[PDB]
Structure formats: structure tokens, C-alpha cells
Design a protein around this ligand. Structure first.
Ligand SMILES: *C/C=C(C)/C=C/C=C(C)/C=C/C1=C(C)CCCC1(C)C
Length: 137
């Protein structure tokens, strides 16, 4: 594969419905949808080690992991979790998450590089799947 690059969002679907499952109230959901439309992702991949920076206009967060090794990050709605990334194929990885504290919907995410040069991110809470599509800058 190779996920390395600077990626800019071109499409974002079902993000509000995801936030709704996660308990976010309507006005905040609308503002978060707007923020998501400015999302940028920077990736550096070395073998199965990933450094990922996801940002919007006013916020930035860094995700560092190695495939197959547990790490800590946060769920979409901001709750600390334990995460584990595995490959599903040559160019797709899937992350399963578990809340460090309490209960909540079952969340996960995937990243995929398509043959047409897009990066597809999916984020899931229970039955609801958000799909976001990026292209290289
Ligand atoms: C591997 C790529 C991942 C895990 C991308 C994670 C992206 C986020 C957690 C972004 C979340 C956002 C919200 C929850 C609302 C505001 C808009 C975003 C895109 C910053």
C-alpha cells in the first residue's frame, strides 16, 4: 500500500447520524458536521507503523500506532478508549475500540486506499456507519 500523504476531504456522509447515536445534541451535531467538512488528514506510514494527524479549523489530534499493537486514543465523541488495528486486505485496515470507562455504543473505524487514489475513512457506532472520502492535496 501506501497511506502516506496529505489528504483533504471531498465528501462526508452520515456523520450527523453517527453523532446522534453517540448522544450529541442537535445544535452541536450541526456545528460538528460543518467542522468535519474542513477535515484534513496527514499520514506518515513506515511499514506497519502509522503516524496520523487529523485536523479541522480549530483542532488537531495525533494518532500513532503499530498494526497489531494496542494503543490508546479517543472515540469520535471524545471518550478515551483502547484500540487495536488489523489489516483486512492489502490496502484496508480496521480498528476495534473498547471504552476505558463505562458503557456506550460499539465503535470502530476503518481506513482504505482505493485503486483510484482516494482515502476512505469509515467510523461506526453500532448500526450506523459514517463514510468520509479524501483525495491527496
Ligand atoms: C484513522 C483516522 C481517524 C481515526 C479519524 C479520526 C477523526 C476524528 C476523530 C474526527 C472527529 C471530528 C468530530 C468528532 C467532530 C468535529 C469534526 C471532526 C472531523 C474533527
Amino acid at each position: 500500500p501506501n497511506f502516506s500523504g496529505n489528504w483533504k476531504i471531498i465528501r462526508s456522509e452520515n456523520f450527523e447520524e453517527l453523532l446522534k447515536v453517540l448522544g450529541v445534541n442537535v445544535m452541536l451535531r450541526k456545528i460538528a458536521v460543518a467542522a468535519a467538512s474542513k477535515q484534513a488528514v496527514e499520514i506518515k506510514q513506515e511499514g506497519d507503523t502509522f503516524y496520523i494527524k487529523v485536523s479541522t479549523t480549530v483542532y488537531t489530534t495525533e494518532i500513532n500506532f503499530k498494526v497489531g499493537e494496542e494503543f490508546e486514543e479517543q472515540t469520535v465523541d471524545g471518550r478515551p478508549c483502547k484500540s487495536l488495528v488489523k489489516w483486512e486486505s492489502e490496502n484496508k485496515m480496521v480498528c476495534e475500540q473498547k471504552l476505558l470507562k463505562g458503557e456506550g455504543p460499539k465503535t470502530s473505524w476503518t481506513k482504505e486506499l482505493t485503486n483510484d487514489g482516494e482515502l476512505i475513512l469509515t467510523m461506526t457506532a453500532d448500526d450506523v456507519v459514517c463514510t468520509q472520502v479524501f483525495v491527496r492535496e
